[PDB]
Design a binder for this molecule. Sequence first.
Ligand SMILES: Nc1ncnc2c1ncn2[C@@H]1O[C@H](COP(=O)(O)OP(=O)(O)O)[C@@H](O)[C@H]1O
Ligand SMILES: [Mg+2]
Length: 379
Amino acid sequence: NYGTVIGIDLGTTYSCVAVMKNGKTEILANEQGNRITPSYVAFTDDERLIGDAAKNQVAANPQNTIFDIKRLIGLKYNDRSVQKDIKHLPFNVVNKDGKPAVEVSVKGEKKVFTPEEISGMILGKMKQIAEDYLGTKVTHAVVTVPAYFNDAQRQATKDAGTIAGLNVLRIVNEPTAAAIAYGLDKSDKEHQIIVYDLGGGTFDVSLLSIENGVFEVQATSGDTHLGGEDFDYKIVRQLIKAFKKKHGIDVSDNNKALAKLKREAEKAKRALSSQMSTRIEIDSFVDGIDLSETLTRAKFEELNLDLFKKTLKPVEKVLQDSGLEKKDVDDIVLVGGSTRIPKVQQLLESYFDGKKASKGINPDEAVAYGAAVQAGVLS
Ligand SMILES: Nc1ncnc2c1ncn2[C@@H]1O[C@H](COP(=O)(O)OP(=O)(O)O)[C@@H](O)[C@H]1O
Ligand SMILES: [Mg+2]
């Protein structure tokens, strides 16, 4: 007995849980009412914090707040990518039996956790959310991974499930999950699908073929270090410059101030997806002095245009590797939170000669949605 099988997008920066129950697939909000949950775990003297609460206290506890664990899962310590990644992480990463693991303080003493264990904490939260939603136990799940993940990375994700008390019945590719969400599995002919996925930390482009219900990953490309967080940082840098100009206070080496800027920068960015201008305000920012700035959409676009344009290169590469033309693409699936940015949509549409991308499904949720659809077949 599988019970009610749930779908989980275990993302680099955010996680999302969904379930198909009686003819409807829904995305399930957490206890704070958020339909997506930060992929964060924090260890304090009292509390193991998971999700929103963990991300909220990051500045107060940077050495014991874990994020970007997906960058380490299923890999070896001496991997080129791992060595590069651990330089930019504020918490301690150690070599444990040839594999990267996080080192924190739990009781006042050093404790080591595997990426499987950390991911398992996040998956456990997703499970608990689903259990309240359904009013029943949950034992089985479908969990998504990037198309380029290898067996070690897929198995580690399954193992994270096991720690969370979840039997992960299927590991499913993220772009495929998105395509399934849009019902592109049910085509009456052959189609080539481009999935453009711009998230918080990573950018992914994949070409999928679909034939009589069978998906194949034809080509993948992207940038593992290009996402929404990078767009936030450009705003952060402008705010540092502005506050220094006005008040003679440079916050470049003030981590708590920088974290406040990062939070407000992300808020401003989100606002500029639907507004032309926004107010960035922090009361009593440094030394009782208020931060009060304005950011326009035009300026945000100006600051990020080069990064936005960088996304078109992997799209070109995917078409070249598969040997297809732009006109040969039947569907463009826009997923990932950052695809809400008007300029991103504009640049992708103009690249495909005016072809409209499919964006009707909430881009934060499409992957989890598709996971839940596939899970529904197993229920
Ligand atoms: N309305 C919006 N406008 C611009 N960016 C957004 C918006 N909503 C969410 N984002 C960004 O999407 C990113 C998260 O992407 P998402 O796909 O949800 O997670 P992940 O990349 O972990 O799978 C964050 O950088 C967030 O700021
Ligand atoms: Mg994602």
